[PDB]
């Protein structure tokens, strides 16, 4: 959006449990859900290359 999405206040997503509003907000621009895994700089380098 116009503002940065820096802190962990915007991103959260479950898997396997019923979560309808993350599907209702799917294609909306604000929340940007994430899979709760931060790849290290090694896999980051691998993805980059």
């Amino acid at each position: 959006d116009r503002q940065p999405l820096n802190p962990a206040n915007i991103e959260a997503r479950h898997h396997g449990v019923s979560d309808v509003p993350r599907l209702g907000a799917m294609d909306a621009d604000e929340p940007l859900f994430v899979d709760d895994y931060r790849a290290t700089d090694d896999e980051w380098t691998l993805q980059k290359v």
Partner: protein, 63 residues
Amino acid sequence: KRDEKHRHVVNVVLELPTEISEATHPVLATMLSKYTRMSSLFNDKCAFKLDLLRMVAVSRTRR
């Protein structure tokens, strides 16, 4: 009564045909209780159908 809410959601939001219902499907029998308490989002039926698909998939998993 909540019976009208159940039939309304299963015939308008879900478009589930008649041969499959909560008397025939236990995942609907456990998801009706969480589909009554959601008041909005009834214009976008596709999200409810996708949630129902992923719930009936995750109920039928051996892991």
